[PDB]
């Protein structure tokens, strides 16, 4: 969801295409597994469980800095 | 309002519940779906005395 | 009259097993027949102390009441999957349609019209109108955010509003 | 916000504690949305 | 057995009784007992103790509490993954998941009403069985008994159906997806083409490359800004063919 | 139809839309018999009630500066599909 908009920005501005993010399909898969009472956690290298969300301030920081 | 068994661990062959409790899958079917009673606990000393 | 309930039990329970046959014909769906039968039981047992054709009257009454509640609720027809055509058709009548990555990226871009008219305003006035009209703060909160008396916030609001009204005239832009 | 550093993906049985920790609330009502106002009913599947 | 002797034991129907059997279950005793009986000799019963040993030992080593096989709380998937959209004609369309969840909810609430009302044990037991069967239909529909059906006698798709098959979320929502910057059309023979070339219909290429054409359009002075460039590419203004 | 924010309207008055592209519409906002329509043209003009949280910050700046109408709408007009 963020990668597509940032890609359109990059092309329209003549910049390089950015690095891809995480597919929504994988998050949906995890939500379905959880809805099946399967506890599915994404582990990092150290063994801790990563939590998957998105920062709300980025869109607000850019949108607010837009006006000045 | 009352416990429910996860059908994946009951009906999936071989039955995971049935192999955990050493119960036949059809007897476990009779228990879960209220065809038959099962004995949860027994008082050994009170029965012997 | 507790024993009466016990009487209920016996005289009720075999009849109930036949009442299913009456509900299945009515609902045409076996799970809804079980639901209707059990609902008939809840209505009967609580009101059995008041008083089989009687249980059939309670049953049919509960079915028709379920019909009446069905008239009040939104009409739902379940589907294996919602099609993209239905999503688009539903979006055509929605407050916000289906936006595209292009529309998102271009909407995130600077206006280069409104922004220029805001930069022409002095920093105090554009800040006051930003916290007031754009953000929506009440006036006292604007007097708190920047340290000024109420008078400078209100005056800068009116004068900045006037100047911005001069810098652009648009029915839409 | 996050590149994928994921080392591995683990799956196990979820207890009721896990399910209640996931939950943002309990759905107590069969109602979906109001037919007149098209607003999700409270304590419903869309609440 | 309850009238006389009732205070010497306890027994029950349903999944609450299975849960009680798991609470009193001693996993290490059965684990090393089955290891012993399986290691002692070879035969059919040894295969019984081996196959039982795989699951019992599985619950022993993994740290999974077997109580996880019996649920006191059912998760509810977020509503965007099971949406509800109104159609032309005033009707609404819900994912089957909403009807399954709704059946579990109604039967659970009726079970609560029966517990409060002090109903006969036969009625309460019927409601408990209906609850177990409805949660069954929610997780895997049709795996046991006749599937729960919607209108037209169509079995509803359960949570297990989303993960299974060629139409599930594994095969066609993960291994493959619909993509932007793509098109299709009928193919005709290209005899004048070089082996490394293909003919692209003009409008198709203009749509496919649209952002690039907009950027190169704002680089030159054809477009004042990028929004007007979008307006020009959408209107197929004659300036777009050189840039394209 | 009726929406969360109230009834839609089929109308000739479509915000942010020039009089040049409304030329082939009648007084109701419906295209006129015999009109030549192309990709993207307006067939039936329609507006849908919008919420005040859906305005861009600039749109809200205009609405608050000029004291514009309380009714905010989106352009849902029926348009000719691509390649028609």
């Amino acid at each position: 969801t963020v990668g597509r908009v940032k890609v359109y920005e990059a092309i329209v501005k003549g910049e390089n295409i950015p690095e891809p993010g995480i597919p929504e399909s994988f998050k949906v898969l995890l939500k379905e597994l959880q809805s099946l009472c399967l506890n599915v956690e994404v582990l990092s290298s150290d063994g801790a469980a990563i939590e998957l969300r998105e920062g709300e301030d980025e869109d607000l920081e850019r949108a607010a800095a837009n006006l000045g | 309002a009352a416990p429910v068994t996860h059908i994946w661990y009951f009906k999936g062959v071989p039955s995971r519940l049935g192999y955990l409790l050493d119960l036949a899958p059809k007897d476990l079917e009779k228990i879960i779906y209220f065809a038959a009673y099962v004995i949860t606990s027994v008082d050994e000393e009170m029965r012997h005395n | 009259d507790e024993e009466l309930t016990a009487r209920f039990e016996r005289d009720a329970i075999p009849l109930l097993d036949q009442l299913y046959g009456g509900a299945l014909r009515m609902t045409r769906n076996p799970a809804d027949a079980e639901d209707l039968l059990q609902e008939t039981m809840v209505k009967a047992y609580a009101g059995f102390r008041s008083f089989k054709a009687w249980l059939y009257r309670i049953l049919t009454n509960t079915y028709i009441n379920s019909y009446r509640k069905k008239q009040r609720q939104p009409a739902e027809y379940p589907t294996e999957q919602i099609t993209d055509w239905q999503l688009a058709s539903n979006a055509e009548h929605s407050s916000t349609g289906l936006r595209s990555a292009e529309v998102e990226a271009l909407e995130a871009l600077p206006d280069t019209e409104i922004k220029e008219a805001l930069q022409a305003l002095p920093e105090e006035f554009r800040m006051a109108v930003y916290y007031a009209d754009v953000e929506g703060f009440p006036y006292k909160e604007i007097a708190e955010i920047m340290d000024t008396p109420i008078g400078t916030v209100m005056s800068r609001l009116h004068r900045g509003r006037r100047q911005l009204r001069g810098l652009l005239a648009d029915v839409a832009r | 916000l996050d590149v994928n550093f994921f080392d591995e993906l683990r799956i196990g049985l979820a207890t009721a504690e896990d399910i209640r920790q996931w939950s943002y609330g309990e759905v107590k009502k069969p109602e979906t949305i109001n037919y007149r106002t098209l607003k999700p009913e409270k304590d419903g599947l869309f609440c | 057995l309850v009238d006389r002797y009732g205070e010497y034991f306890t027994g029950a129907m349903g999944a609450e009784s299975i849960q009680k059997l798991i609470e009193n279950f001693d996993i290490d005793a059965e684990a090393e007992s089955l290891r012993d009986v399986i290691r002692n000799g070879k035969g059919q019963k040894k295969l019984r103790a081996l196959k039982r040993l795989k699951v019992v030992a599985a619950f022993q080593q993994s740290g999974n509490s077997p109580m996880g096989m019996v649920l006191d709380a059912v998760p509810v998937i977020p509503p965007e993954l099971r949406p509800m959209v109104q159609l032309d004609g005033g009707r609404f369309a819900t994912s089957d998941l909403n009807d399954l969840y709704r059946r579990v909810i109604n039967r659970n609430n009726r079970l609560k009403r029966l517990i409060d009302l002090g109903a006969p044990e036969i009625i309460v037991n019927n409601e408990k069985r209906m609850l177990q069967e409805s949660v069954d239909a929610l997780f895997d529909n049709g795996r046991r008994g006749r599937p729960v059906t919607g209108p037209g006698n169509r079995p509803l798709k359960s949570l297990s159906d989303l993960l299974k098959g060629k139409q599930g979320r594994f095969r066609q929502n993960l291994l493959g997806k619909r993509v932007d910057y793509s098109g299709r059309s009928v193919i005709v023979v290209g005899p004048q083409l070089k082996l490394h070339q293909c003919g692209l219909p003009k409008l198709m290429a203009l749509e496919l490359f649209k952002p690039f054409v907009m950027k190169r359009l704002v680089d030159l002075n054809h477009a004042q800004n990028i929004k007007s460039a979008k307006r020009m590419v959408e209107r197929q203004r004659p300036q777009v063919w050189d840039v394209l | 139809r009726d929406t969360k924010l109230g009834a839609e309207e089929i109308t000739r008055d479509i915000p942010n839309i020039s009089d040049e592209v409304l030329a082939d519409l009648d007084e109701r906002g419906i295209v006129r018999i015999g009109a030549e329509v192309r990709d993207g043209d307006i067939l039936v003009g329609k507006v849908t009630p919008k919420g005040e949280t859906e305005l861009t910050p600039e749109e809200r700046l205009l609405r608050a500066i000029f004291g514009e109408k309380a009714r905010e709408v989106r352009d849902t007009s029926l348009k000719v599909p691509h390649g028609e």
Side-chain angles (χ1 to χ4, degrees), chain E residues 16-29:
Chain E
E16 189 168 350
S17 68
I18 301 302
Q19 188 175 51
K20 215 61 184 176
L21 297 177
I22 302 183
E23 278 176 344
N24 305 332
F25 187 79
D26 192 334
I27 188 168
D28 296 313

Side-chain angles (χ1 to χ4, degrees), chain C residues 74-139 141-146 148-162:
Chain C
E76 299 181 10
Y77 104 119
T79 178
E80 177 161 338
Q81 183 158 26
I82 299 182
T83 65
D84 299 331
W85 180 90
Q86 291 166 325
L87 295 176
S89 178
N90 176 80
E92 292 301 330
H93 307 268
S94 76
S95 176
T96 168
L98 301 178
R99 293 165 53 139
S100 62
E102 168 178 50
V103 167
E104 301 291 339
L106 298 198
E107 188 148 333
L109 285 183
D111 205 306
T112 68
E113 255 201 43
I114 299 293
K115 185 188 181 185
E116 305 276 43
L118 281 178
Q119 290 169 333
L121 238 72
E123 189 167 350
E124 331 296 329
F125 294 69
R126 69 186 287 187
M127 219 67 182
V129 306
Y130 165 63
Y131 289 114
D133 303 280
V134 171
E135 210 59 40
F137 283 104
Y139 300 146
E141 266 191 275
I142 313 168
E144 180 181 354
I145 291 174
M146 319 169 297
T148 40
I150 318 170
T152 123
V153 168
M154 292 287 294
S155 181
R156 283 162 166 173
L157 255 191
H158 299 73
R159 295 191 278 164
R161 277 190 178 104
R162 262 175 168 171

